Amino acid sequence: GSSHHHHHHMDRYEIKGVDVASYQGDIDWRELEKQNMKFAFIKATEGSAFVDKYFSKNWTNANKTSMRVGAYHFFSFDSKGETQAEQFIRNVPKYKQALPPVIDVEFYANKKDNPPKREDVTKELSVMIEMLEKHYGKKVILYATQEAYDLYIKDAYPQCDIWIRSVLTKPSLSDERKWTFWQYTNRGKLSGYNGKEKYIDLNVFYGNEEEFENYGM
Amino acid sequence: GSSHHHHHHMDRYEIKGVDVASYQGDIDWRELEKQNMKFAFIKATEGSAFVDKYFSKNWTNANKTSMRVGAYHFFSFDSKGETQAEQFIRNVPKYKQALPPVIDVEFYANKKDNPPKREDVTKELSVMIEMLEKHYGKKVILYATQEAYDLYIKDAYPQCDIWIRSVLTKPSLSDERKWTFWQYTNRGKLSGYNGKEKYIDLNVFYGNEEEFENYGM
Ligand SMILES: [Mg+2]
Ligand SMILES: [Mg+2]
């Protein structure tokens, strides 16, 4: 069920941003910008053939603002990394000022009833990372939940930055790695004109404004 | 991030229903009824003083349908069970045909950074259960997440029925207890006229239609 309390980010992290998919509906990007949202990661693709229905619109509209904007791919355990990379690449244009690409690795559907083997994830995810890093010229970010991190990402992928979900506690990775982004709530608290409780993910960057401005550059 | 895939309930469970709070917005209860939703649990109260802003409206409108309707209390770790029970009781009318009351026990805010001691939860939750069972004349349901169940509910509360959240896997309780309700998704898949992807929790009852009709009676 739902509490009226919210989980907040730690005060030391002042660079905040959102991540969205089509399920967040019609987004007023100028209104998010007015709430000091500094970045957005927008869902583009999933698996080897799916395209989020609002990716095109969100990409165009978010990029009209001053926000730093990137795209994410929702990883599939059931198709090859090469095909998944090709799908993200067909959909997401190269743009020097964009944020680095994100691959989102987490459980979905029934996959947690019979978790994929780590070896099989390493093979396919490593191909994706190689292809995206080469194409966009930027170090790839891996988003994960705690369970997916512990089972697939921990003690691995030193060539990537980590974006960790931690919506109930302060953020920490089980191998003591440092995180680069932290997703701190699924139901971000929002002001301004249409302002209301919304199911939209909120996040912070680890560092300061200057680090932010130079991130992935 | 968000997958376009959904987690579905096992085919053997045919009695489906929803749970909602104000965050689900304006609900067309007749439209849910038209999707074979057989029950609803509606958030009424939280802690010792909070009232969900749509409880009154949802209770009235859902009860106009043929659905079986109950209310839930979102438990606070920071006030007494007696005061929390008194708050649910002031807000939720007694109704013979209603579903039993639910107490929702899960982490929120920062509470998972320093989890409450089991003893302290047993004291306060037991008072709530005693007071609600006496007042409504129905066995109380405890909703919990896996983590809250394992830390507070497991090997305890034999006087209650269990409503377990399991949105990534088939349902099972770590002490091998049988569950009575199972929350299988946070983003239920919805048809009909306003039909769209919605952030609304979907659930199944363990049993058949006749058991359902007699449940809590
Ligand atoms: Mg690692
Ligand atoms: Mg138990």
Q: Percent helix, strand, coil in chain A (nearest 5)?
A: 30, 25, 50
> What CATH number has the domain bearing residue B52?
3.20.20.80
Q: How far is CA A191 from CA A31, A38, A40, A194, B52, in A?
A: 9, 15, 17, 8, 19
Q: How many CA atoms lie within 13 A of A18 on its CB side?
A: 25
Question: If DSSP codes are grouped into helix, strand and coil, which group holds residue B169?
Answer: coil
Q: What is the DSSP letter of B206?
A: S
Do B1 and A143 form a contact (C-beta atoms < 8 A)? yes
- Closest approach of A89 to chain B, Cα-based (Å): 19
**Separation CA A44–CA A93 (nearest Å):** 11
Give the number of whichever ligand sits closest to the CA of residue B179.
Answer: 2
Asked if A125 and A149 touch (Cβ cutoff 8 Å), the reply is no
b vs e for A49-62, b when ≥16 Cβ sit within 10 Å of the residue's Cβ?
Answer: ebbbebbeebbebb
Resolution expressed in Å: 1.4
Strands A68-74 and A37-46 turn out to be parallel
List the domain range (segments joined by +) for residue B106.
Answer: 1-217
A38 touches B: beta carbon within 8 Å? no
- How many domains, in total, are found in chain B? 1
What distance in angstroms lies between residue B155's CA and the mean position of ligand 2's atoms?
4
CB-closest option in A2, A5, A104 to B43 = A2
Method: X-ray
Q: After which residues is chain A broken (C to N over 2.5 A)?
A: none
How many CB atoms are located within 10 Å of the residue B133 CB? 17
Cβ-based contacts under 8 A for chains A and B: 83
Show the tokens assigned to B94. Answer: 């007694």
Alpha helices in A79-117 (DSSP H): 81-91
Distance (angstroms) between ligand 2 centre and the Cα of B140 equals 13
Scored b (16 or more CB within 10 A) or e, A6-34 reads ebebeeebebbbbbbbbbbeebebebbbe
CA distance B92 to A149: 42
The Cα B138–Cα B214 span in angstroms is 12
Q: Which ligand is nearest to the CA of A176?
A: 1
Among B92, B113, B106, B112, CA closest to B44: B92
| Cα A199 from Cα A178, distance rounded (Å) | 27
- Please state, in angstroms and rounded to a whole number, the distance separating the CA atoms of residues A5 and B74: 11
Closest CA to A169 of A159, A181, A184: A184
Of all ligands present, the nearest one to the C-alpha of A178 is: 1
Ligand 1 centroid to B169 CA: how many Å?
25
Q: Is B161 on the interface with A (CB under 8 A)?
A: no
Q: Are B101 and B137 in contact (CB under 8 A)?
A: no
If residue A58 lies in a helix (H) or strand (E), which one and from where to where?
helix A55-63
Residues on chain B touching A165 (C-beta within 8 angstroms): none
Q: Are A138 and A216 in contact (CB under 8 A)?
A: yes
Task: Name the minimum distance, in Å, from the CA of A116 to any CA of chain B.
Answer: 14
Q: Which residue numbers come right before each break in chain B (C to N over 2.5 Å)?
A: none
Is B104 touching A (CB cutoff 8 A)? yes
Residues of chain B with C-beta less than 8 angstroms from the C-beta of A1: 19, 21, 41, 43, 72, 74, 104, 106, 143, 201
Cα of A214 vs its chain's centroid, Å: 18
Q: Are the beta carbons of B175 and B153 closer than 8 angstroms?
A: no
**Are the beta carbons of A112 and B19 separated by less than 8 Å?**
no
CA atoms within 13 A on the CB side of A160: 29
E strand residue ranges, A16-99: 16-20, 37-46, 50-51, 68-74
A175 CA from centroid of ligand 1 (Å) = 7
Contact status of B22 with chain A (Cβ, < 8 Å)? yes
Chain mean position to CA B205:
11
Query: d(Cα A89, Cα A25) in Å, to the nearest integer?
Result: 24
